[PDB]
């Protein structure tokens, strides 16, 4: 803070400054070269010569004006001083002056105050008003230099202080760990510091300014901080000639104001701003510290490059947007993307406030021709993508971006109808501003959702002008934009895997106030229904003419798929808006009302039919290649995922008849198709992966949750044995992720556990062939057999049987004995594996316990056993 022990302020600007500053680069102006790269940077100029001439001219002008001669350079004192002082101030801003030059110019400004440690300076020479304004600018720069020096000194002290504080905190942590056993009770209160966010830790560690003995900071560290704070206060002047820049400036401004009635409002404002700055030295630090960031040495070059890109982007705000400037700022945005400091220091990014700069750019681009089609849609998309990534970087960035929600929602209809521009719209920016943030989702207001609902209603009432201009059939609504508005509402109502009750209720109420947001169907007064609408979409997809414009997807929209996606998004939004089971059980009137509304809106039969709608399987053809239906131009399992979600959330499955009916209409065909798609060629197709994802995400977890409904199910044995066979075959099928395999395991285990023992005979027959291989896939069958035999040991061992279930048919006993002997032989002849043996041993023990000890080895084999269907690999 101070050059020596004598706490006297040094000359401003003189000293060691380490803060990052823009690089100074110039290009040689030559008209014989043809490089064309010299058009970056300003042309060169002799800076040393300019500095020396400026100093000499300023000295001469000061000495001449001290005589008050009637021959000023240029004819007037203004003409003599204003240009020269302007050039001098520009050079000082550039930082060309160094050491001796700064001393000389400071002595010229005021010889008495700026002594190094009959002559009058500029400040006391009866200057005109423009000269006074320029001197005010100069003194403002000097104050800025003082503030920057204070910031640098604060950081310099802050390092050693933080290092000592961290060392002492580690020492206290170690002593707490050592005294844990004796102290017991107070260990929690001592570790509360070690279990609070680092901001809170530092807040309490610094919470010792006045009394507040509740501070673990030791006396030496407290004394160091207090001494530095006192020194900083002394430097700021909080606590004989002027001897100080602050006193000199205050006296000069007061003297000017009380000597002349200033006719320049700009001069008055500058003078009083300078006076307030002198009297509010603490306020300078209050403004500067939030915009102060520190980095390590390794990040210096990357930070400099990022600052250069940000400076170019900021400078482009002062030029009218055109093709070249749009290209430049797109390149700068990409450079800021590529710079790794943008991801490492989101706090630095926010302090620089480049989100606000890009926001102003987007505002300018939209406002230019807001009435007509927006110019520079590429620039709008780039700005929106930058804001989305900035939101994704950090939660604090998301909160900062949340403040501009109103403008983004107002301009949410920028590029919704244009494909390939997803994630590059103001609606996408708003969705990122609220996505997966419970604070911001709860902070969402009702007018914002009302605006979104109004936009959705407009989309559902009126067609798309751009689409009908390109040539798409003129239906009476806008599914493409409606789907995006529904997606934003989904993000508003669903957060972190949980439904926001307030937002869900508000959205449902607005949707039922404006029924046109549900599309042409579900409006009533002639609406067909969900199932009829989706069948119509299937027909539209099948018929090319109503699908494309009919004058790489590129400009194609696939209007049938657009309608399907809109209805699926609406169904998913309503399902996520549905109330929860615990609230329904508690009996909340609002929850019951919302559930009744949704049940009346969407009939259960429509959901059942839409789920029962079949897909288009990929087909192998001649030349040994597969033809694959297009994902984007047809029905997709993502559509039925929304139906499953809504059916589970609103109607729910709580009765065996409905469970089994739904299984036999909608789920079993899909499981069978996915199992049939398990061959090597078809397994990598889009249909297969999408169907596997849909199954293991929606259908199998639902069956796992509703497994206990399989308790008394004797008559539908064929159905729920076909289910088991399809599940096992699909599990044996390859190209499945670990999560999908685990979901299959859990579903099959739960269903088999809740099933009756006497009716899993066919699954046992399938498993007795595959288990003895003891390959990687065998772990799930071993667990299944272990659990089954442990639960149903009485079904075999006791001659009477478990009860009304009965006893074995003696071919179940033959199969069990074959399974036991096969597993035993395989484990005997198999090389040791830890987990495989740890899973195989309980299975063998369970089968041995289940088998009656006096069971007769059937020399008379089962009744002309039918293994003709059974095969190697093919199995059928």
């Amino acid at each position: 803070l101070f050059p020596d022990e004598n706490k006297k302020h040094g000359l401003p600007g003189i000293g060691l400054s380490t803060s990052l500053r823009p690089r100074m680069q110039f290009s040689s102006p030559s008209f014989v070269s043809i490089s064309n790269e010299c058009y970056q940077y300003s042309p060169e100029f002799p800076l040393d010569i300019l500095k020396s001439k400026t100093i000499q001219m300023l000295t001469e002008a000061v000495k001449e004006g001290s005589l008050h001669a009637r021959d000023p350079v240029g004819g007037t004192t203004e003409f003599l001083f204003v240009p020269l002082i302007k050039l001098f101030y520009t050079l000082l801003i550039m930082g060309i002056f160094h050491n001796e030059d700064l001393k000389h110019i400071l002595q010229l400004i005021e010889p008495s105050v700026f002594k190094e440690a009959p002559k009058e300076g500029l400040l006391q020479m009866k200057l005109p008003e423009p000269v006074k304004l320029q001197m005010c600018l100069l003194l403002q720069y000097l104050c800025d230099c003082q503030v920057r020096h204070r910031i640098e000194a604060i950081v310099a002290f802050s390092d050693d202080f933080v290092a000592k504080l961290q060392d002492n905190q580690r020492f206290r942590y170690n002593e707490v760990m050592q005294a844990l056993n004796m102290s017991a009770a107070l260990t929690a209160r001592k570790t509360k510091e070690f279990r609070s966010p680092p901001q809170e830790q530092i807040n309490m560690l610094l919470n010792f300014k006045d009394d507040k003995s509740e501070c673990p900071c030791p006396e030496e560290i407290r004394d160091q901080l207090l001494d530095f704070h006192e020194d900083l206060m002394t430097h700021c002047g909080i606590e004989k000639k002027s001897s100080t820049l602050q006193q000199l400036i205050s006296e000069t401004m007061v003297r000017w104001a009380q000597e002349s009635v200033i006719e320049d409002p700009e001069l008055v404002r500058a003078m009083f701003v300078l006076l307030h700055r002198q009297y509010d030295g603490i306020g300078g630090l209050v403004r500067a510290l939030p915009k102060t960031y520190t980095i390590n040495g390794v990040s210096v070059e990357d930070t400099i490059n990022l600052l250069a890109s940000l400076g170019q982007i900021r400078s482009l705000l002062s030029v009218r947007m055109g093709k070249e400037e749009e290209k430049l700022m797109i390149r700068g945005l990409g450079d800021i993307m590529n710079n790794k400091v943008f991801y490492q220091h989101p706090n630095l990014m926010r302090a620089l406030g480049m989100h606000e700069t890009v926001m102003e750019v987007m505002v300018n681009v939209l406002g230019g021709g807001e009435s007509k089609e927006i110019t520079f849609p590429k620039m709008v998309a780039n700005c929106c993508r930058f804001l989305c990534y900035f939101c994704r970087i950090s939660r604090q960035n998301q909160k900062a971006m949340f403040d501009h929600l109103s403008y983004l929602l107002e301009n949410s209809s920028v590029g919704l109808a244009s494909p390939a521009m997803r994630g590059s719209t103001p609606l996408d920016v708003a969705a990122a501003s609220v996505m997966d943030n419970n604070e911001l989702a709860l902070a969402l207001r009702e007018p914002d959702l009302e605006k979104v609902v109004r936009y959705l209603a407009g989309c559902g009432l009126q067609s798309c002008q751009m689409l009908v201009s390109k040539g798409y059939p003129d239906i009476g609504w806008n599914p493409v934009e409606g789907e995006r508005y529904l997606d934003f509402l989904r993000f508003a109502v669903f957060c972190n895997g949980e439904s926001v009750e307030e937002n869900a209720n508000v959205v449902v109420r607005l949707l039922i106030r404006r029924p046109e947001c549900f599309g042409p169907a579900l409006r009533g007064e002639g609406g067909n229904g969900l199932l009829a609408a989706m069948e119509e979409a299937i027909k539209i997809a099948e018929d090319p003419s109503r699908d494309g414009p009919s004058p790489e997807e590129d400009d194609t929209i696939h209007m049938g798929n657009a309608i399907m996606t809109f209805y699926s998004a609406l169904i998913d939004l309503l399902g996520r808006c549905a109330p929860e089971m615990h609230l329904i059980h508690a009996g909340k009137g609002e929850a019951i009302r919302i559930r009744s509304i949704l049940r009346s809106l969407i009939p259960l039969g429509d959901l059942v039919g839409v789920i029962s709608i079949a897909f288009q399987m990929p087909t192998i053809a001649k030349d040994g290649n597969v033809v694959e239906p297009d994902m984007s131009a047809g029905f997709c399992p993502d559509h039925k995922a929304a139906m499953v979600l809504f059916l589970d959330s609103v109607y729910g499955i709580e009765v065996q008849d409905f469970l089994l009916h739904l299984l036999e209409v909608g789920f079993l065909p899909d499981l069978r198709a996915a199992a049939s798609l398990d061959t090597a060629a078809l397994s990598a197709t889009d249909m297969a992966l999408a169907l596997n994802r849909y199954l293991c995400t929606a259908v199998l977890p639902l069956l796992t949750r509703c497994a206990p409904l399989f308790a008394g199910t004797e008559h539908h044995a064929s159905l729920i044995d076909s289910l088991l066979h399809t599940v096992y075959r699909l599990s044996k099928g390859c190209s499945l992720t670990k999560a999908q395999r685990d979901s299959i395991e859990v579903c099959l285990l739960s269903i088999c556990g809740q099933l009756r023992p006497s009716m899993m005979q066919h699954l046992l027959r399938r498993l007795v062939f595959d288990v003895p291989l003891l390959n990687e896939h065998a772990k799930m069958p071993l667990k299944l057999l272990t659990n089954h035999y442990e639960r149903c040991w009485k079904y075999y061992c006791l001659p009477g049987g478990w009860g009304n279930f009965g006893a074995a048919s003696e071919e179940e006993l033959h199969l069990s004995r074959k399974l036991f002997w096969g597993i035993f032989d395989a484990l005997s002849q198999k090389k040791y594996e830890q987990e495989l043996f740890k899973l195989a041993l309980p299975c063998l023990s369970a089968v041995a316990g289940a088998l009656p000890p006096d069971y007769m080895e059937s020399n008379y084999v089962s009744m002309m056993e039918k293994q003709s269907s059974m095969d190697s690999e093919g199995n059928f």
Binding site: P515, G524, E525, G526, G527, R593, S600, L601
Partner: protein, 159 residues
């Protein structure tokens, strides 16, 4: 002095219909005896056909706030915009309510308005809301002012 609606007062619920480009005044009416459903009785042709106001006259038995209604459901008022009222048929003695069943004439998401004996539940209660911007929530109900009634149970308007 414009009079204010006070609980023990008999009222008729009129509405305007511009059928075939001609204004008609229809009073909400109900029979109660053998016909729970409600209908509309024309009053614009009073000079040629006498209206039957005996089945149109309603009485405001109670006027309680939303919170008071919720408390009462859990376990001489003057009408204020925001209260929940109990409209009792003067002739039948039964109360206006939104019936659970609907005529199902493509309304789908709508119910029917009729009469029922029991005051239990929130079906019989209706909340008053102002018509235009001049009237606000929480001020007194005037005789000449228009209003919109919202069913408490079905959150639906008389339509």
């Amino acid at each position: 002095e414009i009079q204010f609606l006070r609980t023990d007062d008999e009222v008729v619920l009129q509405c305007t219909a511009t059928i075939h480009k001609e204004q008609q005044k229809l009073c909400l009416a109900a029979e109660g005896f053998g016909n729970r459903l409600c209908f509309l009785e024309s009053t614009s042709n009073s000079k040629n056909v006498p209206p039957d106001l005996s089945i149109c006259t309603f009485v405001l038995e109670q006027s309680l706030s939303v919170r008071a209604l919720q408390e009462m459901l859990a376990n001489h008022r003057t009408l204020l915009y925001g209260h929940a009222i109990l409209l009792r048929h003067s002739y039948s003695g039964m109360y206006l309510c939104c019936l659970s069943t609907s005529r199902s004439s493509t309304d789908k998401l709508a119910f029917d308005v009729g009469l029922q004996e029991d005051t239990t539940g929130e079906a019989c209660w209706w909340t008053i809301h102002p018509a235009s911007k001049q009237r606000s929530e929480g001020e007194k109900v005037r005789v000449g002012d228009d209003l919109i009634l919202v069913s408490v149970s079905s959150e639906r308007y008389l339509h």
